[PDB]
From a paper:
The solute carrier 13 (SLC13) family comprises electrogenic sodium ion–coupled anion cotransporters, segregating into sodium ion–sulfate cotransporters (NaSs) and sodium ion–di- and–tricarboxylate cotransporters (NaDCs). [name] and [name] regulate sulfate homeostasis and oxidative metabolism, respectively. From an overall view, both the [name] and [name] form a homodimer, and each protomer consists of 11 TMDs. The rest TMDs form the core domain that is responsible for substrate recognition and conformational change to complete the transport cycle.
In this study, we determined the cryo–electron microscopy structures of human [name], capturing inward-facing and combined inward-facing/outward-facing conformations within a dimer both in apo and sulfate-bound states. For clarity, we have designated the [name] conformations as “IN/IN” for the inward-facing state, “IN/[name]” for the combined inward-facing/outward-facing states within a dimer, and “[name]/[name]” for the outward-facing conformation of [name]. Furthermore, the [name]_IN/[name] conformations imply that each protomer within the dimer can independently execute the substrate transport cycle within SLC13 members. In this context, it is remarkable that TM1 to TM3 and TM9 of the dimerization domain maintain its structural integrity throughout the conformational change process, only minor changes of TM4, TM7, and TM8 are detected, emphasizing its role as a stable scaffold. However, the core domain, a pivotal player in the conformational transition, undergoes a notable movement. Furthermore, a more intricate conformational landscape emerges upon comparing the IN subunits of [name]-IN/IN with the [name] subunits of [name]_IN/[name]. This analysis reveals a dual-layered transition involving both horizontal and vertical displacements. Notably, the N and C halves within a given subunit undergo a remarkable conformational interchange, a dynamic interplay that mirrors the broader conformational shift of [name] during the transport cycle. Specifically, the binding pocket in the outward facing conformation of [name] could not accommodate the cholesterol molecule.
Author numbering:
A (entry chain B): 8 to 161, 233 to 309, 325 to 403, 418 to 588
B (entry chain A): 4 to 163, 232 to 309, 323 to 404, 416 to 589
The structure:
């Protein structure tokens, strides 16, 4: 009768019951670690960064990769950019610059009940474009829970609509940049490998197809969240001025931070694609040496040096490592170690030639079902796990049926970020679920209607303006047969 | 005038960056740019102008900007097999502090040995160096240190001088774990690389084995240990009150109570990890590596650390209507030093940059035109160059570079090719100044008791003692052993 107490002790031993690997050679040994980590990632029977250290344990014990080969995959070029942007987000949050450019988009728009939760949507949609959406949901949500605390002192539907609009617009602003969330970053890191002579994916070629795709989302989702819930005021227009004059003039530590933000954003836009010759032609002797991560490290290391107050820098190391997520680094490294182990074992050739019967359907239905299943699966598991487990599976599916790899991997890396419904493994509707509002069914009913319009504009996006961009009907010389 | 004095570590960084800028732009070669990258970074911790994990991120910034190695390759040097061992062995260290396993081993050691400062820093050195001749150096320094820090903290807390006695126990463990690894072949990774290179370069020799390495390296290491103890203990701190400090320890040990369930499991796993570390490949007996002798060198000591360190996240500790594990992982993220993983990775990246650019070959091949010298002087030049080069690169990378440079040099000048290779292998392990050169030097740097000037000032004397004892041994008691004065028959005649 005591089995329900120690519940994920007796469940975590499925090291024993699926063990049909003493019968097969090498690829079932790699498809044993793939099932175990997926079972521990879906149900979350472990702290979710402990399972990422499991490919560093049994892949040397099976004889697939050496232990110094697995350890090299735990720190890729994503981690330098992750250090560089969290060096900026520490100084944005510490010197209260996020409150400066969130109470400014409100009071510029009106305080009407239709336009207030459009400025609330567009503040975090511009904040999450550069930082991570887990960071920007932790900054905007404490502000707007205090603004509506004031607007009722000058009911329940308005506060819950504001609670879900931030958590939706944070994941809406998670795309339009590779650096906006971890999903597009690990997709770009997986795309730099496995397709070496392909030169089509950069920061300029990412903003072009994704900024029309997620601004129509923001304007078609606000109508859906307004229709579902909502259909004297000079004092409430003054109660926002109550805080914007409580904060004094703009300080030196905020001018330096926004200047270093604008300078960091003007780079990544001037190592351009074919439109403009950029500063990457200054280093013409070495084409792929200085990446987007060396820009983040050049700017983010200036926060440890520039004086702020008596000296003491803008940020210190003790308040930096108290801000950086050291779980996401280990989790992404463990995903890359398992993705690199399915290649050195021959599993992602067996999945590629066992799914060649699937290339008899039309090519749009394949990406439709591979986006629908990754959208239905990501509502219960973590988002850097659902796209982790599927990218070494969908990629040999493209190379075997003569379909472009960006034809399949692009609508599958954006639809996996459409996590609007169950708050069991989601950040932004995790942070917003820490308050005592926003019941479960009211999130699901507002989330499936925005998931429909999220999938529909991606399905009309890849059929109108991306097929003349990445040449997705004319399967290239790279990734051969 | 005081504005120059208060902002002195802002003007110093931007002064020493711009004053050395003619060196990579007048000299356009990659050795000059890598020497600029080395001299700028190594000055930034020796003066300690920036935090040490911020200066370690500078190889990830200017090595792609000079054109030495791409960002995808310089990012793959910030995580090696040391980091899996560091992740695994700290899960044990997180759990022995939470359930107070230390202050039960510590308070029992204190009230069975006594409060004596000079004779406690000899028992900490003679036990670390005896444990390090069977285990790894990094594996030894990670186990003795959380117990010894608790021992001296319980000795300090029984006062009812303390800051300077905390650097002693860091340095005398981080140095003894290194000195004790010279006595055996398998005790460190420099001796194994040298023994596998010497046997494939010079067959028909049959000389280097267990017992033959012990009878020239243990009397050398014992004198280095006995003199480093006197040097370190003089450098820092050269019975009515006493028996009252023996009652505080007794009354603090009795208020622990009986040993609980959560201490027994971590005590058992501490023994199991040290038993699996010893029996992997002890050399004289085949270990459990023979079970995997079709994938050789695949499972290292980091696999053993991970396999037992991830068992703390699973084993139940307290009921709730769930259970609770032993470590809960949020107590792990606060306990784990994340500044040391970047400091060791930035040191690995510099060592890879000096190999990719060609500065290490440039330094090594300037030893070739020194053939027209007496034989004891080329030994002293090569051993000094090796001790200088091991302070910025790792020890398995320095001996790998310097063996194919010193081994043909010894055969051209009609010298036995063990008279040159033995003192250059033992001097490769003498990494004592910086915490980026030796991985045991970074374990004791994870506790915050030291500056790096205290490391440099104390490891400068141990380096001189170690070079002098090696040069004493290369002329006495080793000369009759390996016959280092006649040109042998397993060496080529021409």
């Amino acid at each position: 009768l005591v089995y329900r107490r120690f519940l994920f002790v007796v469940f975590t031993v499925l090291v024993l019951l699926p063990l049909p690997i003493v019968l097969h050679t090498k690829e079932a040994e790699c498809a044993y670690t793939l099932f175990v980590v997926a079972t521990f990632w879906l149900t979350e029977a472990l702290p979710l960064s402990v399972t990422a250290l499991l490919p560093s344990l049994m892949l040397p014990m099976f004889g697939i990769m050496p232990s110094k080969k697995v350890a090299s995959a735990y720190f890729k070029d994503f981690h330098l950019l992750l250090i560089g942007v969290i060096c900026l987000a520490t100084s944005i949050e510490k010197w209260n610059l996020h409150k400066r450019i969130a109470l400014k988009m409100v009071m510029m728009v009106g305080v009407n009940p239709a336009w207030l939760t459009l400025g609330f949507m567009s503040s975090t949609a511009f904040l999450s474009m550069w930082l991570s959406n887990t960071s920007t949901a932790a900054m905007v949500m404490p502000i707007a829970e205090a603004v509506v605390q004031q607007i009722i002192n000058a009911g329940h539907v308005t506060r819950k609509l504001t609670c879900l609009c931030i958590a939706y617009s944070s994941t809406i602003g998670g795309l339009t940049t590779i650096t906006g969330t971890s999903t597009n970053l690990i997709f770009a890191e997986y795309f730099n490998t496995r397709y070496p002579d392909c030169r089509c994916l950069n920061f300029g070629s990412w903003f072009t197809f994704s900024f029309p795709a997620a601004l129509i989302i923001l304007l078609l989702s606000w109508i859906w969240l307004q229709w579902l819930f909502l259909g004297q005021q000079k004092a409430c227009a003054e109660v926002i001025k109550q805080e914007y004059q409580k904060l004094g003039p703009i300080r030196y530590q905020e001018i330096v931070t926004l200047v270093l933000f604008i300078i960091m954003a003007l780079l990544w836009f001037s190592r351009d694609p074919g439109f403009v010759p950029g500063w990457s032609a200054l280093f013409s002797e070495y084409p792929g040496f200085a990446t987007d991560s060396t820009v983040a490290l050049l700017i983010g290391l200036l926060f440890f040096l520039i004086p702020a107050k008596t000296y003491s820098p803008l940020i210190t190391w003790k308040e930096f490592q108290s801000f950086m997520p050291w779980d996401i680094a280990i989790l992404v490294g463990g995903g890359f170690a398992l993705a690199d182990g399915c290649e050195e074992s021959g599993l992602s050739k067996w999945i590629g030639n066992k799914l060649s019967p699937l290339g008899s359907l039309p090519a749009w239905l394949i990406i439709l079902i591979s986006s629908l299943m990754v959208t239905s699966l990501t509502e219960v598991a973590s988002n850097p796990a659902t796209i982790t487990l599927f990218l070494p599976i969908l990629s040999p599916l493209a190379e075997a049926i003569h379909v472009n790899p960006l034809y399949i991997l692009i609508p599958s890396t954006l639809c996996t970020s459409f996590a609007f419904l169950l708050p069991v493994a989601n950040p932004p509707n995790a942070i917003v679920f820490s308050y005592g509002h926003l019941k479960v069914i009211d999130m699901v009913k507002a989330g499936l209607g925005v998931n429909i319009v999220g999938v529909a504009v991606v399905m009309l996006g890849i059929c109108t303006w991306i097929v003349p961009m990445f040449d997705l009907y004319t399967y290239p010389s790279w990734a051969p047969a």
